[PDB]
């Protein structure tokens, strides 16, 4: 299952994530692929806030699905 995480700026990257795998596992891979901490970027889909402790199938996230990302400005 290779989905496409699209950010606000307009960055859609192909990221593979199992449906059972929680959002943390996704932000996890996305964190090691882009360098964005799980608690630094907020993802949204179908008007639902993807919580760190939530599954994908719950938000009807299919393959190549466009997952909205929100990069939290101001780091450290």
């Amino acid at each position: 299952m290779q989905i496409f995480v699209k950010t606000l700026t307009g960055k859609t990257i192909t990221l593979e994530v199992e449906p059972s795998d929680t959002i943390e596992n996704v932000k996890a891979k996305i964190q090691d692929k882009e360098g964005i901490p799980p608690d630094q970027q907020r993802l949204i889909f179908a008007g639902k806030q993807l919580e760190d402790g939530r599954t994908l199938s719950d938000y009807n996230i299919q393959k190549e699905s466009t997952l909205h990302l929100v990069l939290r400005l101001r780091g450290g």
């Binding site: 606000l8 949204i44 179908a46 008007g47 909205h68 929100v70 990069l71 939290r72 400005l73």
Partner: peptide, 19 residues
């Protein structure tokens, strides 16, 4: 088809500088 509608608000909402 209001997926980007509400998201568009988050774009500028996150891009703050002077206000």
């Amino acid at each position: 088809d209001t997926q980007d509608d509400f998201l568009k608000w988050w774009r500028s909402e996150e891009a703050q500088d002077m206000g």
